A paper describes a structure:
The 61 BRDs in the human genome cluster into eight families based on structure/sequence similarity. The four helices form a deep cavity that is extended by the two loop regions (ZA and BC loops), creating a largely hydrophobic Kac binding pocket.
Indeed, ITC experiments showed that the binding affinity of many BRDs was significantly increased for multiply modified peptides. For example, the KD of CREBBP decreased from 733 μM for H3K14ac to 131 μM for H3pS10K14acK18ac suggesting that many BRDs recognize a pattern of modifications rather than a single Kac mark. As a consequence, BRD acetyl-lysine binding sites are deep and largely hydrophobic binding pockets that represent attractive targeting sites for the development of Kac competitive inhibitors.
Residue numbers in the entry: 1083 to 1197
């Protein structure tokens, strides 16, 4: 099980695409949280390892995932950051849960075909 970077990218991209295509639910995740702009200075005290869809795309595009599970970990990291920081009935949390639902449905067959 060694992965050619461009094949790993071609296999995983559709799952990322499916997250981006969710409108409105992807919109808070399409770019990084900037706590200084938002005036939420407690954010990096709770979210130690920020992640968002733009960063995941960059990493997927520049060979930073050697194995499929590192991509999965980063998608879950984005979700878990939102779920820990935000109120359960908040738009961000509700939106996050939708992306998670989409990801769960998308990722499973893909991971089985990879290994």
């Amino acid at each position: 099980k060694i992965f050619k970077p461009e094949e790993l990218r071609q296999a995983l991209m559709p799952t990322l695409e499916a997250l981006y295509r969710q409108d409105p639910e992807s919109l808070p995740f399409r770019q990084p949280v900037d706590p200084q702009l938002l005036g939420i200075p407690d954010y990096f005290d709770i979210v130690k390892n920020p992640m968002d869809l733009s960063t995941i795309k960059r990493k997927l595009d520049t060979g930073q995932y050697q194995e499929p599970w590192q991509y999965v970990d980063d998608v879950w990291l984005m979700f878990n950051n939102a779920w820990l920081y935000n109120r359960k009935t908040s738009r961000v949390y509700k939106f996050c849960s939708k992306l998670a639902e989409v990801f769960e449905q998308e990722i499973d067959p893909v991971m089985q075909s990879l290994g």
